[PDB]
Amino acid sequence: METKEIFDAAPLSVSQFLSETGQGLYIPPYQRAYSWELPKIRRLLSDVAHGLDQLAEFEDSICFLGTVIALRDINYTTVEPKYRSQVPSKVMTIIDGQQRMTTLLLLTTVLHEEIRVRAEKLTRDDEPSVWCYNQALDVTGRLSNCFEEDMRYGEHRYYPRLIRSYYDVWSRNKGEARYRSPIGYYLESYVDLEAYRHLDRMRDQMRSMLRKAVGAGVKREDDIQLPTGTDIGQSQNLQFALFNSEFPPSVVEQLEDDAKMTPLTRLIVFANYLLHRVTVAVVTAKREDYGFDMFEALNTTGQPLTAIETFKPRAIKEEGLDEWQESESKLHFDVVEAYLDREGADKRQTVTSSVLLPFAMFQDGTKLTKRLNDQRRYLRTVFDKDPDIVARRKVLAGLAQVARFYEGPWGSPTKVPSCDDATLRTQAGIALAALREGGHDIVVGLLTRYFAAHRLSSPETVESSARQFLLAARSCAAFYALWRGSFGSTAGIDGVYRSLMTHVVEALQSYLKEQLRSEGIYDKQQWVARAAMTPVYQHSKPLTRLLLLAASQNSTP
Amino acid sequence: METKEIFDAAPLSVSQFLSETGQGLYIPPYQRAYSWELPKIRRLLSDVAHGLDQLAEFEDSICFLGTVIALRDINYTTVEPKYRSQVPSKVMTIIDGQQRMTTLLLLTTVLHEEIRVRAEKLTRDDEPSVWCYNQALDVTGRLSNCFEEDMRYGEHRYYPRLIRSYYDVWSRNKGEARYRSPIGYYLESYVDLEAYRHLDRMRDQMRSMLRKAVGAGVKREDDIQLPTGTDIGQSQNLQFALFNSEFPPSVVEQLEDDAKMTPLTRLIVFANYLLHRVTVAVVTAKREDYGFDMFEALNTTGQPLTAIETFKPRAIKEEGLDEWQESESKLHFDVVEAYLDREGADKRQTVTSSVLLPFAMFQDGTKLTKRLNDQRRYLRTVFDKDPDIVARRKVLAGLAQVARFYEGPWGSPTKVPSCDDATLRTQAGIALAALREGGHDIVVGLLTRYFAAHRLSSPETVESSARQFLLAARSCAAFYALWRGSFGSTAGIDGVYRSLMTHVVEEGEALQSYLKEQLRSEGIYDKQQWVARAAMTPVYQHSKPLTRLLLLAASQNSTP
Amino acid sequence: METKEIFDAAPLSVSQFLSETGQGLYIPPYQRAYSWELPKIRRLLSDVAHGLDQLAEFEDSICFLGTVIALRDINYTTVEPKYRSQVPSKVMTIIDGQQRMTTLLLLTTVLHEEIRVRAEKLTRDDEPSVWCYNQALDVTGRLSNCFEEDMRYGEHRYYPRLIRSYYDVWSRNKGEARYRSPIGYYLESYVDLEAYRHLDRMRDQMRSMLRKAVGAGVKREDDIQLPTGTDIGQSQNLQFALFNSEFPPSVVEQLEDDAKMTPLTRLIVFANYLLHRVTVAVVTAKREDYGFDMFEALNTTGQPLTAIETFKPRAIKEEGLDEWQESESKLHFDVVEAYLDREGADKRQTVTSSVLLPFAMFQDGTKLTKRLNDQRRYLRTVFDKDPDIVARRKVLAGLAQVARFYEGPWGSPTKVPSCDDATLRTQAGIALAALREGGHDIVVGLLTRYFAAHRLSSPETVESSARQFLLAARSCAAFYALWRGSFGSTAGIDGVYRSLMTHVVEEGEALQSYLKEQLRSEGIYDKQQWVARAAMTPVYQHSKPLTRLLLLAASQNSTP
């Protein structure tokens, strides 16, 4: 009867799936122990963060924690200890996604207690802040709806039939932590014990990553960016989407001050964006062998489409159409060429991410990120910000980031003006050679205005730009040598390079030196001192840069 | 509203997906060209062929060509040149699965003409054999319902509106061929032209692939396992399953004779298994970026589980229960060790199949075949063939194939008895080292059973006996290998080796020598002749065999 | 897109529909006030009782409280006072079915409070009876999940915005009565105020309706047939269905003792059968004017087919098949004639019930009851109890009850033998004219079986004998009827009549006189006593019985 069970696929928010009134999710006897890796959880948390984030301006935009294949066991022929009296009504045996799910439940754990204990630090009563107290109470109860249920009496299932897995006992223990009134202080959890070790650690680390995103520190290389109170309140769309109703005006302005609740409310905002706007795909097969054949049917489908391949059509079908071997077609020819050369399947994705992320800075300096979502949407927003005249420029600017990839960065470094005070060329080539070796990669986007030098009013004012570019390359490598070379590490450089693009030749030397003065690093002595106690074993490249910078000099003294 | 559009997914037969009366499938400007390679098309046809096959015995079992993500273009914002006057009612823009789809349409293409021209060779009127002509008519029409539709008049879409891609022109022209009254002759078709060439070539190669499995020749390395009339008619399940009805008694007996019709009826049974019992699941998004986000959501899901990982549960939860670290638990510990050692992700499955295929011979010698379905089901059938005493035996036999793998399959060749007429040990080590370099791999199962019984012997009292039996078996196995290899080619030896596993008899060692020699004489033995075939061969069939043969003519000259 | 919203229909149990964790059921302003009438609530509780009842033997059979049309109001454009911050997420503005909904909501209420306080008189801890305390706790929670939800803080939806309708105030007030710990004592409640009066009254009357069916008193004319503990424990089907698992054996025997827990556990069984095995159908249109046009479309469809009309298909398709102008066709022709005559539209159902209810006695005396389910199933069980020789008989027996319907009961009273001691004929005609006027109606089935054996007597051979035994049965029946009527009431006479067609035995006319007198004495007879009870009666029970007794004191003095 083919339209038969076989499949049954349904989209569910996390709370539709996890807070069902009868259901129980069951890890089968053949699935292994937890075994997810802190980068993969970082990725998952940052992806739901992307959902929360993109929600404020694109009213739709739904996140997607993948799919799970489950087997609707009616006859409880799966449940490990039978004890048929009190098995739940709906038992879902998770085939695939058993690792995903386990982080997700644990996420509610951190999101419960944090949101809970920050609500115990709440001011009891003062103003629209008890507003925050109820908005907490609501989400906390609604997450306790995700861990567990009530049922009859005693210990949650008869009187001696218990829960001992890593995820299982872990969840039983957070249940206990929440149940216990008394006072709301922070919690602390307690075959191969490596299982339990990894699970408890990853749980406590999710609690850490979230306790991280709550009071300033900055990170980028990790950390996930909850929109903050200062900008949660200027977006009606987030208000309504997450709380079905606009916030008290009497609350957005104590949010504007970044008050004691703006950490807690941020957690809360994330929690509701987690609980109602991120969706898992569930396929419930009702015969497990169909589950397996369907597991294969799900693992062998995809190839991939590059963000450039996914938007080319929207150029090819924007201003140019059919009779479209046109101007923007030349600008595209360039980038399709570069990608065809510097790649060939996952190589295609990493390369094109290499081109879209500096182009990001190149336009109004937004920090693009890998995710095919953000790439599709950034290219489309930028392009479609105007009419069929700036469209041309946006596309040519991708092509130009490409041209820059071919000249200076890698390639063979030589090229710029070749003769324009030739000492200057032979030395700024070192900037282009070294900056292509460590944390300076935004330097690539800012320097991508020898693109301005290539796109010039020709001979009229060509050499002036051919010179400006060398100058920027140098000053790039120099401020680099300082910041990275001088004490600390990167992330800094990266942010400040971002804003010396949006927040505004000699102009960049002045601002970059200005930022150096800001970092308490402008004034001889100090910097040399700070530099002395760095490491170099930070960047082998930086080490050699500095050694050559004290050495090569003594060829004129 | 989260339960909103986003997903909406549903399972469909091929005719359910393709012969909906309003739909037309659309390839967006961002998908590439066709570009599947002969291996993957073989794999797809074999998957439906395996499906048809497993249908005859398992009344269930459904084939499964993955999933397809498509975009229900309601406002036609996707279609390249518009011409809205006559756009179809349902337009689905294929995101993922356009390659599968394009082969699948083409498949119906070939099965139309073949089933069609082969039914022209039908006997007009004699008997329940006109049954075959009608059953032809049904599928030819129902597959033409998959390429194309009807609609108003003129050239199938107004009067200046055309279809010119590789897939498009392919189906437009094949349609005309079928449309053409005249006479039912076979078909022959007519941006960068590499596209058009590759596509037309893959259609003609499926017509070749299927025209193969219809008159005898054999391939194994290719060709697909379509059941034959002689066993299509002794299977009610296939009759009812594909035709809602049991064939006329008047038809199974002209089917058993493998009559002129039976290639056609086999092809027809295949077309119906494709048109109705292989089903793909379709996800219809109604916003394009949801389509993309969810292609991603599907690509980052699956791992895999070795057929052993999915059967462990049914052992640990058979006789042993919770209080379960028992005899069968040790027998399993062994195999978990060998697989954990000789592997760790796609390595795990290749390891477990290399272990399972000879055990399949080790138990009652069925030829397992890679596929995780077939592996799970054989493990379950064998294990559940008896009671709480033989289950132990089927699991212990698996563990022993593992131990075998560790002793002399590769390993270090050395080992057998070390001292039991040491000439025979140092020579049988050559047999065991040689058989692990070319086409003798079913030999792996046989030798696994002989020295397995040497490991599990009546210790001391009769241990040395089976100990020596092992070395004798290995010598003889590499022998029959040297001979059947210098014949001309493999496979043959493989099947004969499979059958001496099963085709013996005498109430409840020399036996194998006798049976192998008897088969060698069934082929060709008797000095002279064989030597001829030796010169006839190549050695450049198996370099391993070449060196064994050179050593077997040379090494001889140290005593003569 | 026509496949669009328009409909969207789904079957849901009471708990699936009422206890959604986000949902709110909202009655639009244009709907009228509650205004259901105690007969209709009797009907609904009795029908869920019928479902529970027929559950124990038919593992399937599901109850069916009609359908409701609702509007998934997303923009809350319906809600009377807005206050949007804390509106629920899913608000289901009920178009049709607003009254069923109220009675059903109120029902949870009575079943909550009763199940609750009976569990407070529970024995704390002794035995499998804390089983009763837990099963109480569970159903109590699951019914509070039907009234209300938790939401933020304060009074359950902001702080100065409240719920004041008739149904609304009821539910807010019972919410309070339930929430308040203290101790578990019985409850006591608190435009036009007649509205509120009727609703509050109906609610307490459902409580008086269920608290009745719990300690002995008897009714038939009211009170619903909750299966009892003495027969709830011998049906695994009910055990598993309502509680997913078979009762502790240690509890069915304290159930067999009809112990203190047995009303409460009976109530709990009733509540679970309501909350999980009766299902309402919901149609959610997503545009309210579509809701209206659908309300109309659903309102004008059905006719109805009599249980005889639905069974002919299974007779005409048992032994007789297409080639069916046969014997049972003659026996059914008889009944089809009478029903075509004695009717023409709801008259059809009343008539065919008049024919089916006495026949059920005619076979092995089961008591049929109006409901088209029970009639369908009794006819099929009776019919399919054997093979094609007794089936003929089953059908002929219906035909013969029909013939009876034409002779005696109504008709013209005259007829029996016409000449067989004509005094007895002119007398038994009075019994036949009288019994068709009041509670003596099972007597109609008994006289139907006796003169059925008379019309179908060994004609000539033994015919006159049956022609007489019939009139003898008629007189004896009107007499036992007069005695049991001057007792006090009916009810008992019908049950005695019911088992004297089932409670006999003597290997495979006087018998009935003897057995009827034996029952009359198991009550009270012996001249004197009987006469006493006569003075005790009323005459103002059945006008017919009064006129009969007057004639039986009068006509007598025409011989004395």
Short mmCIF file of C-alpha atoms in Angstrom, two decimals, chain A residues 365-489:
data_model
loop_
_atom_site.label_atom_id
_atom_site.label_comp_id
_atom_site.label_asym_id
_atom_site.label_seq_id
_atom_site.Cartn_x
_atom_site.Cartn_y
_atom_site.Cartn_z
CA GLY A 365 32.07 45.46 7.02
CA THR A 366 29.85 42.66 8.24
CA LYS A 367 31.60 39.58 9.57
CA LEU A 368 30.46 36.67 7.39
CA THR A 369 30.71 33.16 8.76
CA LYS A 370 31.03 29.91 6.94
CA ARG A 371 27.35 28.80 7.42
CA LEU A 372 25.68 28.40 4.01
CA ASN A 373 22.70 30.24 5.51
CA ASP A 374 24.56 33.43 6.34
CA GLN A 375 26.42 33.28 3.02
CA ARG A 376 23.25 32.99 0.88
CA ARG A 377 21.51 35.71 2.88
CA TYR A 378 24.48 38.13 3.03
CA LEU A 379 25.07 37.96 -0.72
CA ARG A 380 21.32 38.47 -1.32
CA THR A 381 20.86 41.33 1.14
CA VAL A 382 23.95 43.26 -0.06
CA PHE A 383 23.06 42.77 -3.71
CA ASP A 384 19.36 43.63 -3.29
CA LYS A 385 20.00 46.71 -1.12
CA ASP A 386 19.39 48.93 -4.13
CA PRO A 387 18.85 48.86 -7.88
CA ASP A 388 20.50 47.51 -11.03
CA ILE A 389 23.35 49.94 -10.81
CA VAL A 390 24.89 49.08 -7.44
CA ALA A 391 24.19 45.40 -8.12
CA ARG A 392 26.99 45.63 -10.68
CA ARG A 393 29.39 47.02 -8.06
CA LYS A 394 28.56 44.39 -5.41
CA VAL A 395 29.25 41.58 -7.91
CA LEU A 396 32.41 43.15 -9.30
CA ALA A 397 33.61 43.47 -5.66
CA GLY A 398 33.35 39.73 -5.18
CA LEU A 399 35.35 39.35 -8.40
CA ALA A 400 37.86 41.81 -7.05
CA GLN A 401 38.37 39.99 -3.77
CA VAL A 402 39.14 37.13 -6.15
CA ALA A 403 41.67 39.16 -8.15
CA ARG A 404 43.37 39.95 -4.85
CA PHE A 405 43.58 36.27 -3.90
CA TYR A 406 45.55 35.80 -7.16
CA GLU A 407 48.06 38.70 -6.89
CA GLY A 408 49.47 39.59 -3.44
CA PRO A 409 48.39 37.17 -0.56
CA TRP A 410 49.56 33.85 -1.96
CA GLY A 411 50.49 33.57 -5.61
CA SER A 412 54.14 34.57 -5.41
CA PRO A 413 53.77 37.97 -3.61
CA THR A 414 55.69 40.04 -6.18
CA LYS A 415 53.30 42.39 -8.06
CA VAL A 416 51.93 45.80 -6.96
CA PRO A 417 53.55 48.55 -9.04
CA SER A 418 56.92 46.81 -9.70
CA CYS A 419 58.51 50.27 -10.16
CA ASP A 420 57.13 53.12 -8.04
CA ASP A 421 60.10 53.82 -5.79
CA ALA A 422 61.21 50.18 -6.13
CA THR A 423 62.53 49.85 -2.60
CA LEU A 424 58.89 50.33 -1.64
CA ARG A 425 57.71 47.46 -3.83
CA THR A 426 60.50 45.07 -2.81
CA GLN A 427 59.67 45.68 0.85
CA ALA A 428 55.81 45.83 0.90
CA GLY A 429 55.98 42.42 -0.77
CA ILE A 430 57.20 41.19 2.59
CA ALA A 431 53.97 42.47 4.14
CA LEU A 432 51.97 40.56 1.57
CA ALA A 433 54.11 37.49 2.09
CA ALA A 434 53.99 37.40 5.89
CA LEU A 435 50.42 38.56 6.49
CA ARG A 436 49.49 35.43 4.54
CA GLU A 437 50.77 33.27 7.40
CA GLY A 438 48.84 33.90 10.64
CA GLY A 439 46.00 35.80 12.38
CA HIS A 440 46.12 38.65 9.82
CA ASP A 441 43.48 37.55 7.32
CA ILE A 442 41.17 40.56 7.68
CA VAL A 443 44.15 42.57 6.51
CA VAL A 444 43.32 40.75 3.25
CA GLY A 445 39.91 42.39 3.04
CA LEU A 446 41.10 45.90 3.92
CA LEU A 447 44.10 45.53 1.62
CA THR A 448 41.62 44.43 -1.03
CA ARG A 449 41.67 48.05 -2.20
CA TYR A 450 44.51 47.70 -4.51
CA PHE A 451 41.19 46.87 -5.98
CA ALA A 452 40.74 50.66 -5.93
CA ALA A 453 44.26 50.74 -7.47
CA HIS A 454 43.21 48.33 -10.20
CA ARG A 455 39.84 50.15 -10.70
CA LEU A 456 41.32 53.54 -11.33
CA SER A 457 41.03 56.49 -13.59
CA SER A 458 43.97 55.26 -15.61
CA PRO A 459 47.27 57.20 -16.02
CA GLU A 460 45.39 60.29 -14.69
CA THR A 461 45.89 59.19 -11.05
CA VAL A 462 47.13 55.58 -11.37
CA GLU A 463 50.56 55.62 -9.73
CA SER A 464 49.24 57.52 -6.69
CA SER A 465 47.03 54.52 -5.90
CA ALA A 466 49.70 51.97 -6.88
CA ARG A 467 51.69 53.71 -4.13
CA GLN A 468 48.81 53.91 -1.64
CA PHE A 469 48.42 50.16 -1.86
CA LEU A 470 52.03 49.38 -1.04
CA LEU A 471 51.72 51.80 1.89
CA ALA A 472 48.65 50.07 3.26
CA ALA A 473 50.24 46.63 2.88
CA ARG A 474 53.16 47.79 4.97
CA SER A 475 51.13 49.55 7.64
CA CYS A 476 48.99 46.39 7.82
CA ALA A 477 51.94 44.07 8.50
CA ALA A 478 53.33 46.70 10.91
CA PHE A 479 50.24 47.18 13.13
CA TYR A 480 50.05 43.43 12.86
CA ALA A 481 53.62 42.98 14.10
CA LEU A 482 52.67 45.21 16.99
CA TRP A 483 49.32 43.84 18.16
CA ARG A 484 50.11 40.16 17.59
CA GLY A 485 53.80 40.60 18.33
CA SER A 486 53.10 42.86 21.27
CA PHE A 487 51.65 40.90 24.14
CA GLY A 488 48.44 38.98 23.96
CA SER A 489 46.87 37.30 21.00
#
